[model samples]
Target: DYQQITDVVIARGLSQRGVPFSWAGGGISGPTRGTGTGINTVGFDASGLIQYAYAGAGLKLPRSSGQMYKVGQKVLPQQARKGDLIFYGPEGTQSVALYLGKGQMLEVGDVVQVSPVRTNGMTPYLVRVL
Candidate 1:
């Protein structure tokens, strides 16, 4: 189940490699306009990326990172495998990404891109959704 879920998310995410980054991009219906200023690009935000990927696997995720954090069982980064959700930032508010194993994750920051699992000043919290 883990492998299948990860494969689905990986495929879905890889297809969005060059998609633009928008602070308010993505909704249940797919990418949408953001609510903040200068968010003109209309692409996936961190939570949007996670929501999109899970939706591809037929799982409905919460629309925001904080809400997403509430749904999954907690795990440590070292114990996390592919298809798990990796959250960052403080509790109550956070950024999210999909773990892709091998120290990489699919995330949306400047753009929808695959990056290292850990970064400076960003707390890594793992969650197993499947």
Candidate 2:
């Protein structure tokens, strides 16, 4: 079932709780260095978390957020479901998070944590990957 699949995805992300937030801390091989402007660290970024979580279910994702946005089908905010990818930014997506439903999301800000989906300078966009 879709919910079961999404549950697995969410579980994968939850498993990484407390992992540091790096600018680019994960890849196809799992957590690594940040691929952005010398901000590498021993942790996971927004996209990295998604990539790693999805990979735990045997699905591979792109290394960057924008590219990751391209992998899924677009969905309206109301249509968002657990395991959906949520994007945020101005001109384009600057960050990505995993929608855990009920307006909650898993992302990397100062660190990986589950928080209410929010928008300040950026708007929220939804993408269904699974």
Candidate 3:
């Protein structure tokens, strides 16, 4: 069960990477069809990274990253663990990231990039959503 959770989280999030970014869209919006401004609409962004991760982990997540941010347990940056969800923004009240936590995370920006954790140098507030 634990492995399934981890597998799903990694697979869902990884599968969604390289998907273009869309403004004001939700994770369930499905894959984009074309490349152009407003032509291909991405379902997830930074926060969606976590939402999709949970979905792949065999759990249904809320439609939006913003919504996901609200329904989870808050944790200090140092408390972030594998499979935890991390949020970044002013006061940590905005964008989010999935904490793969070993120097990198799966984040969907313009494209899903396995990026260096703010823990490595960037600044971010962490949250744990299991």
Which prediction has more favorable TM-score, 1 or 2? 1
Please give the TM-score that candidate 2 achieves against the real structure: 0.85
Q: Which stretches of candidate 2 lie over 4 Å from their true place?
A: 35-40, 90-92, 121-124
lDDT of 3 by residue, 1-130 (tens): 8756776677777777677675544453344433345356745556555655675655666654556666666777677677777665554455667777686788766777778775432335455655
As for model 3, its CA RMSD to the true structure in angstroms is: 3.6
**Candidate 2 C-alpha lDDT tens digits along 1-130:** 7678778878989888787777767754556666574265778877788888888668888766777776667888888888888887752368788888888989877777999987664445677876
Structural similarity to truth (TM-score) of each candidate: 0.87, 0.85, 0.71
2 versus 3: better lDDT goes to: 2
Q: Report residue 117 deviation for candidate 2 (angstroms).
A: 0.5
Question: Each model's number of backbone clashes?
Answer: 1, 1, 3
Worst 10 residues of 3 by lDDT: 26-35
- Which segments of candidate 1 are over 4 A away from where they belong? none
TM-score of 3: 0.71
Candidate-wise lDDT, in order: 0.76, 0.76, 0.62
Model 1 root mean square deviation, Cα atoms: 1.9
User: Of the candidates numbered 2 and 3, which has the greater TM-score value?
Assistant: 2
